[PDB]
Design a protein around this nucleic acid. Structure first.
Lengths: 295, 75, 295, 75, 295, 295
DNA sequence: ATCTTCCCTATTTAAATTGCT
DNA sequence: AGCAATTTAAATAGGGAAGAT
C-alpha cells in the first residue's frame, strides 16, 4: 500500500465547472458536454471543486475520498455581502490522526486560550503578508500597507473581546481592499454579485482558499465546527479563518493581477495552482495551524 | 518538481500506463502528461510504472534532464 | 435501490443506489435504471445517503442542502462511508457545533466524566449482547455466557483505572471468542493476519462494524477522534470504541456463521445489511451515544 | 517566441503535417512539437498547415493559451 | 519560398555529433548510429555544425541551402589553436543583398577606415558587454570589469596600427579570462587541447559564436575573406571578429556558469540557443554590422 | 558518376555523382552503387564536386580540406552549385582574399576601370559565339548575324557610360532573338512570365547558365555581389553578368534546338551538361575572369 | 547512393456491445 | 455507472521495390 503522497505536498487544485465527473478505465475523468472527456488527477489533487452543472458519480467520489481529496460545491451563497454556504464533503473513510484537535478543542473550550488562539490566528495573516511577497502590485510593505499591518497588530493585541476581533478584521479586509484599489487604480467594493473582473476572480480565489484550507483542516483533523473567530459576520467555521489568512495575502493580489492583465478563468486557475505550490501555501497552513494546536 | 511524462508505448500497455500516470499528472496531449509532482510522488509513480508490465516506454523530463527512462525508450 | 434506516426520531435516513439523483419540478428527484422518477420527502429526510452507482448534480445538492437535507456517500449498504459534511446546526443561517457534541467533549475533558462514560459504553456492550439475540448464534442468557456478562458487570462497576478497564474488556472479548469457538466446535486464536476463514470473515465483518460506527458518530456530530477506551495515539479510536458495542453481538456470530456455512464475502455482505436494517442497529447506536451524553 | 504544436490527427495526414511542422519546430515526442519560432514563422506555419489537406487537427500553445484550432480538435 | 523566416530570427542552433544527417520524408533528420532519426527544424535554423563522426547527403544540403543554413565542418582542421580553419559551407545559390558588400569592401580597402571600423568591431565588444547582461556571472558594474573595459577603450582609441589593436584585443580577452578565473575561484589558462569542462564548454561556445557570426556574415552577404583584423595570431577571416564580440561577453560567462553549475554538454548547448534568442544575439550582430557598413 | 572538368591547366573539378565519399583505408575514396571505391587524386584535383546522391563524412571532409583540396556541393550535372566555402590563398597557413578577388575589386572601385572592364566582358560575346558554334542554329559567319556582331564591335568600344552598354546589350539580345527566331521560323517576344516552350526553355537554360557562372565566379573566390553592368541594388548581378557571355551564344541556340525537337526538361539538362562538358566552357569562364582581372 | 512513391502485407489500435456488479 | 472481453473494421507500421536525379 506503500505510504501515499502527503496531503501537504499535493499540487494540482481544481475548481471544475460544467461537467460529469466519472471514472472511466479506472481514472477520474470529467465529461464536459462536448462528448469529450478530460483526465483529472485523483492522487495529486488536494481538492476538486464543483461549479454549476457538474455531477459526480459514486465511484468518482470513492477514488477521490480514498486518495484524500476534499470536495465542495461552489454555488449556494444567496446573501448580498457574504459567501454563505459551501457544502463540502470531507473524506471520513480514512481515520485521520487524533493528536491535533485533541488540543484544538482544548483551546476551543477555555475562553482565555480561545481568545489567545484567536489573537495568534489573527497574526497569521500579518506574518503571511510578510513571508509570501510578490514581484508585482503593491510593494509588500510600503507606507500604507505597513501602517495598517502595524495598526492591526496593535489592535488585535489590545483586544480581549471577540466582536472586537471581528471589527478589526473587518477594517483589515476593507482597507486592503481600498489600498489594492489605489494600487491597481480602480474603484472596487466586495459584492458577490458584481460582474467586476476583480470581484469575480476574487470569488474564484476564495473558493481556492477554501479548498486549501479545508484540506488543511482535514489533514490535521480539525473540523470546521470549531471556529476561532465566531461572530455575526462569520458563520462558516474555521475554514473561513484559516482561509482568509491566505486570501488577503495570496488570493487578493493574484485576483487583482489576473483582473488587470487580461487573464481568463483558466489563467487565474493556473496561476493559483503554480503560486500555491511554489509557496507551499498548504504546507504553511498544515505546519502553522500545528503551532496553534500543540504549541 | 515539474515533470513531463511521455509514454511512447503501444495501446495494450499504454492504457495501463495512462491509468497510473493519470493519478499524478494531467493530460497535455498525445500520450504526454505534464504536471507538478512533489518529491516522492515521482518515486511512487516510477514504482507504479515499473510494475505496469513489459512494454512500458516512458520518458520523464525534469528541467531537460531525463529523470527516468523505463523500458527501451527512444532517447 | 431505495433504502431506509432508522435514526432517533423517524426513518429519516435514505440510502439511494443505482440512480442518478436529479432535480425535477423544483424538487430533488431520482432517475433510476427502470426509468421511474421518484421524489424525496422533505420532512421525512434530513439525512440522505448515496450507495453504489449513483450521480447527483449541483442544482440537486444545492436545492437539497437548503431545505435541510445533507448528502453523504456510502458503499452499497449505506453504512460504509466515503465522504460527507459535518452534521452542524441549521446549515443555512448558522454554523455551530451541535449540543450533542458539546456534552461529549465535556465528557472528554474531565477524567472522572470520561471514566463514567467508559463504564456506560462498556455496559451497553452487555446491553447489546442482550438486546440483539441470535437464534443461529448462542443462547446468551445461559450460565457459561452469563458468567462472562457478570464478569463485565463486576469489573466495570469496580474499575478505577483505564488500564484495568481495557484488560477487563480484553478478557471479556477473549472469553466470548473462546465460548463462540466452543459452540461451533473449533479452535481459534484471534489473529488479524491469518488465512483461515474464521479470522478472514471476522476482520471483514469488523470493517463494516467500524463502518456503522462512522455513520453513527457522523450523525451525532462527534468527531471520531476522541476515543474513550482506546488510547490517544490510536488514529480514529472512537470509531472502534462505539463499534465495540456491536463487534461481539451482531458481527461476531454472523461472521462465524459466514465461515460455518461457507458464505463468502458477497453472501456475508448481504446478511450484514439485512440484520443491520431489520433490527435497527444504527438507531440503537445513535440513542446509545445520546445516552452517553444527555443524561 | 515559444510555441508548442500538438497534432491530434490521423497518421497518413500526420506524416504530411510532420513534414511541415518539423521545418520550424523541434520534435519533443509523440506527434508533439515544441520549440522556438517568430511571429512570421507562426503565420507561415499556420498558412502551410492549412493548405496541406483535410483532417489536420493541430493545437498550438503560446504560453498556456491556444494559437490555432485547425480542424475539429478536442480542445 | 513564400515569405520565409528571415535570417535574423531563426532560433534553432545545432552542433550534431556522431549521426548521419539525411533527408527522410522531406525532413532533415540525423540518423544516429543506434538507429533513431531526429528531425531538425531546417527552416528555423541558422546553422548546422557537423561535428566528429557525421556525414551529410546532397539532398540534405539542398534543403539546408535554400532554407539558409550555415553548414560548417568542425574538427580535423579545427584544432582552434590559431583559429586556423573550420570548413564552413555557405549557401551560395541565393543572390544575397549586394549593397552590404559594396560598402564593406570600401571599408576594407581604404586603410584609414579599416582602422576606424576595426576599432568599432572592437568597440562593439564593450557595447555587447554592457548591454547583454547575465545574472549568474559577474556584475558589469563592478570596478574590475569597468577598469579593464576602460583600459581597452583607451587602448583602442589612441592606437593607429593593427598590431597595437591586436595586442589590446589580446590583453582584453586574456584578462577577462583571468578575471572570470579569479571571480569563479578556479585557475584558467585557455589551452584548446585541455579537456576541462570550462575549456570544453568555451570551445563549444566559440563554435556556436562561429555559427551565428557566419550566419550574420551570410545574411549580409559579406564573404569571410575580408578581415578587419589580420595578423599572426588572428587567422580565419572576419568571422573571428564577429564571433569574438560575443566570445568575451556572452559565451564565456555562459561556459563558465555551465561548468560551475555542473550543467551537461547538451544543457550548455540548450542555454546557448535560449540566450542567443532571448536578446537576439543574432539581429544584434545583423543590425550592428549594418551599423559598421553604413558609409 | 565520376567526371572531370578543367579549371585552368591541371587544377581540376572532379564532380562526384551518386557516391559515398568516406575515408577508406587511410585516404579518402568514394563508394559508388556498383561497389567500386576509387582514390581521388590530391594534386590533380583542387575543387572536388558533390553532385546528387553523395554523402561525405567529417574524416573525409577534414582530411580533404587539410591538403589543399576544397569541396563544393552541386545539383545534377556539376554546374548547379548551391553551397561551398570561399576560395582563399591556401586554406591552412593563411586567410586572405584571392589575387583575382583583389584585382576585381580594383576594377570595381574605379569608374573608368569598371567601364573598360565592362566593354571587355561585353566584347567576349563575339568570341563566345565563334568559339562554340553548334550544328543546330545560325552560323557565326552569315550576313545579318555578323552585322549584329559588327554593331557590338563598333559600339561597345566607344560607348561612353554604363546605360549605353545596357542599351547595346539589349539590342544584341533582342536582335539575336530575331535571328534565332528566323532560323526556327517562329515569332519571339521575350517574356519570362510566359508559358510557351521557347520562353520557358530559354529561362531554364538561363538558370542553368547562372549556375555555371556562379561556379566560375566561386572558383576564384570572386564574390557574386560585384556587378560591372547591372545596378548596385541588383542582387547577384555578377552571376547574370558573367552568365550573359554564354546566355546568347550557347544557351539560346540550345534552348531553341531543344524546343524544336521538343524534348523534355531532364533531356534539356543532360544536353546542356553534355555540350557544356565537351568544350570546357567553365574553363573558358575562368580564363575570362583571369583576362579581366589580371592585366 | 539517395530519396521517394507504392502497395501489399500483417497488425496494431478502437468502439461497439454483451453480460455482469 | 463501470469493467471487461470480443469481435470488428480499420487504421497503421513497414519492408522490399521501382523510378528519379
Amino acid at each position: 500500500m506503500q505510504k501515499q503522497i502527503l496531503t501537504s505536498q499535493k499540487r494540482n487544485m481544481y475548481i471544475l465547472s460544467r461537467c460529469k465527473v466519472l471514472v472511466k478505465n479506472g481514472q477520474v475523468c470529467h465529461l464536459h458536454e462536448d462528448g469529450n472527456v478530460y483526465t483529472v488527477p485523483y492522487a495529486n489533487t488536494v481538492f476538486i471543486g464543483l461549479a454549476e452543472g457538474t455531477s459526480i458519480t459514486n465511484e468518482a467520489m470513492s477514488m477521490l475520498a480514498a486518495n484524500g481529496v476534499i470536495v465542495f460545491w461552489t454555488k449556494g451563497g444567496g446573501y448580498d455581502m457574504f459567501a454563505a454556504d459551501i457544502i463540502c464533503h470531507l473524506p471520513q473513510a480514512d481515520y485521520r490522526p487524533t493528536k491535533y484537535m485533541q488540543n484544538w478543542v482544548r483551546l476551543w473550550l477555555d475562553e482565555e486560550k480561545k481568545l489567545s488562539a484567536a489573537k495568534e490566528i489573527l497574526k497569521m495573516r500579518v506574518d503571511s503578508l510578510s513571508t509570501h511577497v510578490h514581484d508585482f502590485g503593491v510593494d509588500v510593505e510600503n507606507k500604507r500597507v505597513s501602517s495598517i499591518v502595524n495598526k492591526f497588530d496593535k489592535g488585535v493585541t489590545q483586544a480581549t473581546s471577540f466582536e472586537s476581533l471581528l471589527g478589526h478584521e473587518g477594517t483589515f479586509v476593507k482597507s486592503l481592499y481600498k489600498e489594492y484599489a489605489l494600487e491597481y487604480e480602480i474603484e472596487f467594493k466586495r459584492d458577490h454579485k458584481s460582474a467586476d473582473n476583480y470581484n469575480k476572480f476574487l470569488t474564484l480565489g476564495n473558493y481556492y482558499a477554501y479548498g486549501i484550507a479545508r484540506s488543511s483542516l482535514w489533514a490535521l483533523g480539525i473540523d470546521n465546527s470549531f471556529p476561532l473567530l465566531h461572530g455575526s459576520t462569520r458563520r462558516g467555521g474555521l475554514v473561513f479563518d484559516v482561509a482568509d489568512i491566505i486570501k488577503t495575502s495570496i488570493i487578493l493580489p493574484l485576483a487583482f493581477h489576473a483582473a488587470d492583465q487580461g487573464m481568463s478563468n483558466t489563467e487565474f486557475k493556473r496561476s493559483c495552482v503554480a503560486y500555491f505550490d511554489k509557496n507551499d501555501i498548504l504546507a504553511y497552513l498544515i505546519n502553522n495551524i500545528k503551532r496553534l494546536c500543540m504549541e | 518538481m515539474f515533470i513531463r511524462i511521455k509514454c511512447f508505448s503501444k495501446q495494450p500497455i499504454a492504457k495501463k500506463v495512462s491509468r497510473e500516470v493519470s493519478a499524478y499528472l494531467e493530460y497535455t496531449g498525445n500520450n504526454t502528461w505534464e504536471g507538478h509532482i512533489s518529491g516522492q510522488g515521482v518515486s511512487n509513480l516510477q514504482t507504479k510504472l515499473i510494475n505496469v508490465g513489459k512494454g512500458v516506454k516512458v520518458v520523464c523530463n525534469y528541467q531537460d534532464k531525463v529523470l527516468f527512462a523505463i523500458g527501451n525508450v527512444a532517447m
